[PDB]
Design a protein around this ligand. Structure first.
Ligand SMILES: CCCCCCCCCCCC(=O)SCCNC(=O)CCNC(=O)[C@H](O)C(C)(C)COP(=O)(O)O
Ligand code: SF4
Ligand code: SF4
Lengths: 140, 80, 87, 112, 385, 54, 181, 165
């Protein structure tokens, strides 16, 4: 309930009405994505995570819980991602990249040459549960 | 009298006060030590035989290691 | 007294010489109403080099819009005789 | 300002060729002042070398190659005006200001 | 606008620094660095060297953080070779990486101070640099270009009594940091020269590929030792300081705090240093001992091969990065199966930082330009390669 | 051989890394009172000296 | 966000025509794309919520003389949001201009200048494309495999002209190539 | 905020209280001992591993150690070493030419590591500045002269470092 004083990130201003901003952005996103063909994996994935984040935003009235439930950083960084998705939606509509070409070909390599434990390796850890739900929803 | 124009030699003369003679080499260069702790216990010096026109390359190889703390053996022990 | 324009009679000969002096131009087809492309056997690249020579001669820049309108001698002449920066 | 896309046809390429030649020629007085060439060469000789360069490449039919040549010419010209590397009878890469060739080459060395 | 062509031409500021500034009186409008004055074709030369012969080129890129680049190159080769490094070697490599971090920060901080007029801390800090330079000389025989960290481990074991002399250094180093701080931190002139100078937001830092202190100054918690750990950094306790304002004063405080954290790491490496080999045992990639080479046919054959042909690296390509004192130092290595690298692209943090001088110095005073170059910590060996 | 450089039995002595603080100064009212008293009494003394010089 | 998730999620979400090759490996997840799609693929990866690739680490060229398109341009990218790296590569030749990504990542500006300097690959819409490392008036592209190691010219002071001048190289002792294969 | 805290802030500003502290610590080092070395009478510390001027070594009999294997020439990252060799009149495999260009060499020590007979070493000498470039083109005889002059120190250093290599 307490107003956030700082995000600790230089140039990222605190957004006091983050809940109202996020609900607006997600609702706008769920309309603009309908210009994409329904069979495209981009449209499916975008709807999947926008809906869950919207449902969380609707349920919780305290931005601290919204941050806690989503696990995706501060509400100000959630607003940035929501704005960027809306921008990407506009570009992808204009680009028209949809559809598989006639003589489509794609080589896939899965190289299993191991690397030592000691060399640098990114190991971020498990993502929030929705990422895996989105992925398995895309597979099916 | 070299101390008046040559201040580098004077610093060695002053630091020589209270020092111990370790040895003399073939060229006449004299080697001194203090056994204290001012520059982290590093108190090895050479007083070159020539009070003028001295040069660092005049230290023989037997004493070069001692002077640079590379070894604890003096030039005499190495030669033996 | 002052003046802003170079007399036309002074301009025609100056354009007449620089085309004669320009190579690939025999000084016999150089009638003052000649076309660099049709009457002078000059390609487009040679024609571009002629307007450049006149710019330097009269000391002033000629815009692309008007660089193209100078396709003949009489046309190059008129433009300079009425242009006040020509000096 | 930015690098333009590759020319669609030889009309677009030629418009660009003409544009470059105009810029190269319009910088000639600046070059003459920088290298102090008033008593070495005439400005038209500078113009002839530029038009020569262009005429030696009149057999190119691919607009992509023409664009690359124009880009390299623009780069070469910018260095000559901004970062002059003065050499007496040489501006950039341009020399400014009874026996056959075999016997001369034979007299010189064994490598022709 | 009139143009000012100011190139600091001596150790005062870098030395090959050449800047074209457009001014409005004393206010800077635009800054254009002209580089390549130290471009020596290192990437081209590496393609003509075996993997061992290319190693000394890394000491001479960021020539203030020598061993940190040797580590990055060795890690890249060990990655493509799938070579396992003994634990003792990993601790020695981390120990000297943090020693190399202190050497870097001591120089960066006190050379920046001398340029704004604080002449004393340079002299105090360089006597501490000499002590650490002695440790480089005792393990490798060179004060700067050690060539000590190698693929598979380190060139030689530590001489007896070195760990004790490093411990005696650590006992007194906190006092040396406190004196540098007491000279600068609280001083009103120092604060006036650095507070709100060269402000960078987090978005700007990510857009311009900033890393290291230049990125952590803007409040972005990102250190490659924690994000993508290597060697034994996962068994060590240290904090990652981050800024809250993103100006030159936060980056100064971070570099000071990073030397205290480097001191903390060195203590843990000293205490946890295990016994064992300092070189990977495989007999295809590491030199034999002198006694073995002079007594065993197999060892002599391997020694002959290693110092003439060098080892081969299977055909592949990868990007390897470490947290160098100046930021993320990366190596894009392309192997074609032979004994020489096919391509070695060197990603230098100072290349990204110097490119951002234009936006950082915008609308600042002329005398703030050197302050901004100081907080970027530019060494042109790695900018130009 | 088998002897390698390392910690002594029990490890090295603990070392501090944090900034040790220092409270050195009179500060505040001490300096202001000293300066004000000096001004008042010294100006009185200036008057006395001027009278003697007169 | 591990490399397993990136490979799978990119297969499901990206438009199919963009990516011609996908390599999942401990050496790095790599996406090969045609030149006409490089700009759009890099804008997708930057803006999309589940990728958030915000940092361009660097751009480099590789010369493959045995290939019809001899140059490979490699984009090493980083997501600080998800702590993951991605490699996007595309091929080019000596005359085909490829798209510049300065409008996406301002840090690409000097790296694309280096690629033009070192390899001769040109970038459409680059605000200021000129050599950045080599000497002014330099001829050739030194990182091409057919460019000689010691170059073609060298400089010296010339007292009669009172200046430093450039002349064809003369080597007192040649580079010795030791073929150990 | 408070008249007492405002007062203290103002007084600290006007009387330069933090500038006094910087003066006090500056004066403390004025009276302390100095760290300056009185070169050339006094020298800085070095170690047995120090990589200095190259030297060619002999056996105690006077025979050269080098057998012209050319390993040092092959490994040299700067290509600073040039070697010619042929069979000696007694059938021995020996160099007729061994040049090190001291102005190309990077003083890496790779040559000393590569040598199988301890023939080429980087000795401890670092004071060999010259007045000409040609004096830094060392031929075989100059290198063997260095070995004779520095042999006593080189041998002691090798005994010291034989426990680590
Ligand atoms: C100061 C010096 C620095 C600047 C100089 C740099 C070097 C300059 C050279 C670079 C420019 C080129 O070669 S760019 C290549 C120029 N050539 C082409 O455009 C190929 C196609 N040919 C044609 O279009 C015609 O033959 C043509 C005669 C051009 C006109 O057409 P006309 O036949 O209808 O007159
Ligand atoms: S020190 Fe290194 S560069 Fe110099 S000669 Fe020996 S091996 Fe070659
Ligand atoms: S010095 Fe040593 S490595 Fe070099 S040729 Fe002679 S024996 Fe071989």
């Amino acid at each position: 309930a307490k107003v956030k004083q700082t995000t600790g990130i230089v140039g990222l201003d605190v957004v006091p009405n983050a809940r109202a901003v996020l609900i607006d952005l997600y609702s706008k996103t769920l309309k603009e994505i309908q210009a994409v063909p329904e069979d495209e994996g981009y449209r499916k994935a975008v709807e999947s995570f926008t809906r869950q984040r919207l449902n969380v935003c609707k349920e919780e009235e305290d931005w601290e819980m919204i941050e806690k439930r989503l696990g995706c950083g501060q509400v100000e960084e959630l607003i940035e991602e929501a704005r960027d998705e809306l921008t990407l939606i506009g570009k992808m509509i204009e680009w028209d990249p949809w559809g598989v070409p006639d003589d489509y070909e794609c080589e896939v390599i899965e190289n299993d040459a191991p690397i030592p434990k000691h060399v640098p390796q990114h190991r971020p850890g498990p993502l929030p549960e929705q990422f895996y739900k989105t992925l398995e929803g895309l597979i099916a | 009298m070299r101390c008046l124009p040559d201040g580098n030699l004077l610093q060695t003369k002053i630091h020589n006060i209270g020092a111990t003679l370790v040895g003399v080499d073939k060229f006449g260069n004299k080697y001194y030590q203090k056994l204290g702790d001012t520059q982290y216990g590093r108190h090895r010096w050479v007083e070159y035989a020539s009070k003028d026109r001295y040069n660092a390359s005049q230290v023989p190889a037997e004493w070069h290691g001692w002077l640079h703390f590379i070894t604890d053996h003096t030039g005499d022990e190495l030669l033996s | 007294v002052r003046g802003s324009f170079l007399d036309k009679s002074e301009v025609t000969d100056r354009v007449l010489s620089v085309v004669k002096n320009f190579q690939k131009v025999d000084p016999s087809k150089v009638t003052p109403k000649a076309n660099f492309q049709n009457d002078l056997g000059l390609d487009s690249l040679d024609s571009v080099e002629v307007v450049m020579a006149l710019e330097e001669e009269f000391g002033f820049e000629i815009p692309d819009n008007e660089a193209d309108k100078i396709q003949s001698i009489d046309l190059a002449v008129d433009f300079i005789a009425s242009h006040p920066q020509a000096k | 300002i930015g690098v333009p896309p590759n020319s669609a046809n030889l009309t677009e390429a030629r418009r660009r060729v003409f544009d470059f030649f105009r810029a190269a020629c319009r910088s000639i007085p600046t070059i003459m002042d920088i290298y102090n060439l008033q008593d070495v060469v005439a400005p038209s000789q500078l113009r002839y070398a530029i038009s020569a360069q262009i005429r030696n490449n009149a057999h190119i039919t691919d607009p992509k190659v023409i664009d690359l040549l124009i880009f390299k010419g623009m780069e070469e010209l910018t260095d000559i005006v901004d970062h002059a590397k003065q050499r007496h009878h040489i501006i950039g890469q341009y020399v400014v200001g009874g026996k056959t060739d075999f016997l001369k080459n034979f007299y010189t060395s064994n490598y022709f | 606008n009139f143009t000012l062509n100011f190139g600091p031409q001596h150790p005062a500021a870098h030395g090959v620094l050449r800047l074209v500034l457009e001014m409005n009186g004393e206010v800077v409008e635009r800054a254009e660095p002209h580089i390549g004055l130290l471009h020596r074709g290192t990437e081209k030369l590496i393609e003509y060297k075996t993997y061992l012969q290319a190693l000394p080129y890394f000491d001479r890129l960021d020539y203030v953080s020598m061993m940190a680049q040797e580590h990055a190159y060795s890690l890249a080769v060990e990655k493509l070779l799938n070579c396992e490094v003994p634990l003792r070697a990993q601790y020695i490599r981390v120990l000297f990486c943090e020693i190399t971090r202190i050497l870097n920060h001591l120089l960066a901080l006190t050379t920046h101070a001398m340029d704004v007029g604080a002449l004393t801390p340079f002299l105090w800090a360089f006597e501490e640099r000499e002590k650490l330079l002695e440790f480089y000389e005792r393990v490798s025989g060179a004060r700067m270009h050690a060539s000590f960290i190698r693929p598979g481990g380190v060139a030689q074991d530590l001489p007896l009594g070195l760990c004790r002399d490093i411990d005696s250094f650590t006992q007194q180093f906190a006092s040396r940091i406190d004196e540098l701080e007491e000279m600068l931190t609280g001083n009103r002139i120092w604060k006036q020269r650095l507070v709100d100078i060269g402000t960078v937001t987090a978005q700007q830092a990510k857009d311009w590929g900033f890393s290291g202190v230049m990125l952590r100054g803007s409040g972005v918690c990102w250190d490659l030792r924690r994000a993508a750990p290597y060697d034994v950094y996962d068994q060590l306790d240290f904090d990652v300081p981050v800024g809250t304002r993103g100006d030159c004063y936060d980056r100064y405080c971070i570099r000071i705090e990073e030397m205290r954290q480097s001191l903390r790491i060195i203590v843990q490496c000293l205490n946890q240093m295990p016994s064992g080999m300092i070189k990977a045992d495989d007999r295809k990639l590491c030199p034999p001992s002198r006694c073995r080479m002079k007594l065993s046919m197999e060892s002599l054959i391997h020694h002959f091969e290693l110092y003439t042909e060098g080892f081969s690296v299977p055909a592949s390509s990868t990007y390897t990065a470490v947290e160098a004192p100046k930021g993320e130092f990366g190596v894009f290595l392309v192997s074609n199966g032979s004994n020489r690298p096919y391509r070695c692209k060197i990603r230098a943090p100072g290349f990204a930082h110097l490119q951002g001088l234009d936006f950082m110095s915008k609308h600042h005073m002329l005398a703030d330009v050197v302050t901004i170059i100081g907080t970027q910590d530019i060494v042109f060996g790695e900018v130009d390669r | 051989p088998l002897l390698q450089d390392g910690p002594p039995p029990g490890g090295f002595a603990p070392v501090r890394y944090a900034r040790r603080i220092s409270n050195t100064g009179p500060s505040a009212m001490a300096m202001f009172l000293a300066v004000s008293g000096a001004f008042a009494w010294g100006m009185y003394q200036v008057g006395q000296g001027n009278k003697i010089r007169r | 966000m591990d490399n397993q998730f990136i490979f799978k999620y990119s297969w499901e979400t990206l438009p199919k025509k963009w990516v011609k090759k996908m390599e999942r490996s401990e050496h790095g997840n790599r996406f090969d794309t045609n030149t006409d799609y490089l700009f759009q693929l890099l804008c997708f990866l930057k803006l999309h919520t589940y990728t958030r690739v915000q940092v361009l680490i660097d751009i480099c060229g590789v010369d493959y003389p045995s290939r019809k398109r001899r140059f490979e341009v490699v984009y090493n990218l980083l997501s600080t949001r998800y702590n993951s790296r991605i490699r996007v590569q595309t091929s080019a030749d000596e005359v085909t201009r490829i798209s510049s990504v300065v409008s996406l990542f301002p840090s690409a500006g000097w790296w694309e200048r280096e690629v033009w300097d070192m390899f001769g690959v040109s970038f459409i819409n680059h605000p200021d494309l000129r050599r950045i490392l080599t000497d002014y008036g330099f001829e050739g592209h030194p990182l091409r495999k057919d460019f000689p190691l010691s170059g073609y010219v060298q400089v010296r002071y010339d007292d009669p002209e009172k200046r430093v001048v450039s002349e064809p190289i003369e080597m007192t002792q040649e580079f010795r190539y030791f073929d150990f294969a | 905020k408070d008249w007492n805290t405002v007062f203290e802030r103002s007084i600290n500003t006007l009387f330069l209280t933090e500038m006094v502290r910087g003066l006090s610590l500056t004066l403390k080092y004025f009276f302390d001992p100095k760290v300056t070395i009185n070169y050339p009478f006094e020298k800085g510390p070095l170690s047995p591993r120090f990589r200095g001027e190259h030297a060619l070594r002999r056996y105690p009999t006077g025979e050269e150690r080098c057998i012209a294997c050319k390993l040092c020439e092959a490994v040299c990252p700067a290509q600073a070493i040039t070697i010619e060799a042929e069979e000696r009149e007694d059938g021995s495999r020996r160099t007729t030419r061994y040049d090190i260009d001291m102005t190309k060499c990077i003083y890496c020590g790779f040559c000393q590591e590569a040598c199988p007979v301890d023939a080429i070493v980087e000795g401890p000498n670092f004071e060999f500045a010259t007045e000409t470039h040609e004096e830094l083109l060392y031929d075989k005889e100059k290198l063997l002269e260095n070995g004779d002059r520095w042999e006593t120190e080189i041998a002691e250093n090798l005994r010291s470092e034989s426990l680590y290599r």
